[model samples]
Target: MNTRTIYLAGGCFWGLEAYFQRIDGVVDAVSGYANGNTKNPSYEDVSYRHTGHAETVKVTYDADKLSLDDILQYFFRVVDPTSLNKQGNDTGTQYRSGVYYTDPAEKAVIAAALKREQQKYQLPLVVENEPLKNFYDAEEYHQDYLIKNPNGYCHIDIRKADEPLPGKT
Candidate 1:
């Protein structure tokens, strides 16, 4: 099966990681840090030291089952793209909303998705779209945090409390 990877930083990686993992075509989702200046930054480095990294998730998906546009469309529904450095109750640069793509071909699709999402709000979207500069796996405990600790705090409501968002299983 052909697969593609994209790194997304939307609020807490814990929530985003858990959210994507539930998607049908998602192969795997790992929590990490991306686009940071420091080498192999720790959670503290990004959360407190201002390492210039956003808490990111490396989402690997089956391209035949789901397109990048499909993944991003669902992403926008769970995040407030107009908010900078914040999502839900989380605040700080580490929690900023961003989409970091590795493939040049995906840029146009990403932009188009963002543009469509932008039309939903009067305020300009603050979501960052840029080439991924760096990525480092977070500590072991953070990998599947929500799965490991079902009661753990999350910025996004993983529960299907309301009507389910598109792409959520």
Candidate 2:
């Protein structure tokens, strides 16, 4: 089974990680920081809203079971692409939407996905598609947070619970 990693920041990584964990092809989701200065920035640094970093989820999935496009599409459904520097009540650069692609092919896929999503909605997408710079894994406590803390905060509002994402592979 060929696997690949896709890094993304939509808000607090917990809920985003949780949703992807439930998706069909995702194998693992780890909360982390992406494309920022200061090696190993703490959660507090990000909370202050000036880390040039984003709280992101580094998702590892099986490509044969699900295409990169599938994951990106599902990601868009769970978070509002038009909302800049925020997702739900969370507001900050850490919560801003971005897709950090490691491979060139993945970059193209993310771009195409953004275009498709933009066409479906009137609002401009703030989803960033850029090369991955760096990603620091969150503290051990943050991993699989939902399984450990059932009542934790969640900002996700799934648009289609049963419907498949457009152009799903």
Candidate 3:
């Protein structure tokens, strides 16, 4: 089975990590920091200092079961692409929306999906689409935070995951 990995930074990693874990094609979802200038940044460093890191989730999925476009569609749904450096109540560079990919072929796919998503908003989409620069796994406590703390604060509406995509019938 072909598997692909993509790093997504959409607000707090807790919500993004929890949401992706429920997706059918996702093999694994890990909380981490990505596209940071510093090496191995800690959550506090990214959250408090100017580490240039975003709280990200490393999503690994089966390519045979879900395409990159499908994954991006779901991501767009959970995030307000128009917002800059924020999602829901979370506000910081670390909470910025981003899609970081390692494979060059996926760039075009990401761009196309981003363009389609942009049409839905009057404001320009602020979601960053860039090459994966760096990724460091966050502290163990951060991984599956929602699973560990079922009542943990999450900006995303978990119920949205159950809804169908716009074009899906």
Candidate 4:
């Protein structure tokens, strides 16, 4: 299966990671950290305090089943891209919104998504787009947390929850 990966952060990584895992073409959505000056940061380091590392999820998907643009669009819908500091009850820099692209093509797709959203909202897109930095796997207990524990905390509020995926405007 042809595949691609993108790292994203919005609110708590738990909910965001769980959200993408439910998508048709998404293979693996892992909670982690990305785009930080620090390397291989721990969840405690990023979460309990500020290490400049956002609580992130690394999403791996089948490119043939879902386009990157589709994923990016859904990403904005699930989280407040314009919000700074945190998402929902989660506070601190670790809960910020960001997209960490793995390649030039992915970067272009992210940039395009930002531009499109910016035009729709008529404001600067606060979403950060950056190259992928080191991604450290979250604690063993945190992986697939929602699936493992259905009652797990999640901040995602899908406004258009019934909207279809893998389609262009």
Candidate 5:
């Protein structure tokens, strides 16, 4: 099956990764650091230093099973596009919302997604849309964190991942 990757950051990676992992077409959703300056940065290096990394999820999905447009829609549902560098109680540059792409063609697709998302917001979207400069896998402990720690704090409502789109069931 043909697959593609999209790096997304919307606050803590734990919840975002968990949300996407539950999607029907998604093969994997891994926590990581995106578009950062440093190399192989540790979780603390990103949090304490000026690594310029956003806590991100590298989502791999079956292209035939799900369109990028649909994936972006699920993203918008869990994020506040208008909010800047924050979601829920998490507030910091690392927690900022963004969509980083690897393919050039996906840029236009992302733009269209943003345009649709903007219609619902009175405030402009602060979610960054850009080519992925770099991404590093997060520490093993950070991977599937919510699943490992069932009661862990999560801003996203991961339950929605199972729901069908607005049309017929």
Candidate 6:
């Protein structure tokens, strides 16, 4: 399958990584540091404010089975778009919400998705839509975190992954 990838930072990479992995079309969900100031920044550096990195997940999916719009629809269901620099109990620049892409054409796709997401909220959504500058794979332990620790904290419900896209079913 030909896969397309997008980088998403909505909070803790542990939960976000696990969430996207549940989707049918997703081929891989990897935890990473995206658009950070330094190269190969550790999780400690980002969480402790040393690196300008956000806790991000690299979502790779089959374009034949899932459109970028469909993925964004699922994204909106999990995150509070109006919240800035935080999601769940996390509060810091590393927890900021964003959707970063590699291709120029994705900007338009992301923009359209965010516009649709904004109509549902009274407050303006602070979810950033930008071109990804760089992304580094997180440490091995950070990968498949929820799968490794089932009782770990998660901002999103694992069951919501089974739900149909809003008004699409």
Q: Return the lDDT, model 6, position 95.
A: 88
Candidate 1 per-residue lDDT, tens place, 44-101, comes to: 8888899999999999999998889888876886788998888867888898899999
How many Å off is the CA of 108 in candidate 6?
Answer: 0.7
Question: What lDDT tens digits, residue by residue, belong to model 5 across residues 30-145?
Answer: 89999888999999998989799999999999998888987898899898888887887788889999999999899999998999889988999989999999999999999999
Tens digits of per-residue lDDT for model 3 on 52-164? 99999999999998888888988988889988988877888899998999998888888899999988889999889899999999999899899999999888877777777
lDDT of 5: 0.91
Over 11-101, each residue of candidate 4 has an lDDT whose tens digit, in order, gives 8887888788777788988888777677778877886656788888999999998888888887988888777876766777888898998
lDDT string for model 2 (47-118, tens) is 784878899999999989878878887788788899999887898888889999888777888988899889
TM-score of every model? 0.93, 0.92, 0.95, 0.90, 0.96, 0.96
- If ranked by lDDT, best first, what sequence of candidates would result? 5, 3, 6, 1, 2, 4
List residue ranges in candidate 2 displaced over 4 A: 158-169
Global lDDT scores for all candidate models: 0.87, 0.85, 0.89, 0.81, 0.91, 0.89
What is candidate 4's CA lDDT for residue 63? 93
Off by over 4 Å in 5: 166-169
RMSD of 4: 2.2
Off by over 4 Å in 4: 158-162, 166-169
Judge candidate 4 against the unseen true structure and give its global Cα lDDT, from 0 to 1. 0.81
The worst-scoring run of ten residues by lDDT in candidate 3 lies at 160-169
lDDT of 4 at 22: 75
Residue 57's lDDT within candidate 6 is 91
Which stretches of model 1 miss by more than 4 angstroms? 159-169
Report clash pairs, candidate 2. none
Instruction: Please name the candidate that would achieve the greatest lDDT relative to the true structure.
Output: 5
- How badly does each model clash, as a count of residue pairs? 0, 0, 0, 0, 0, 0
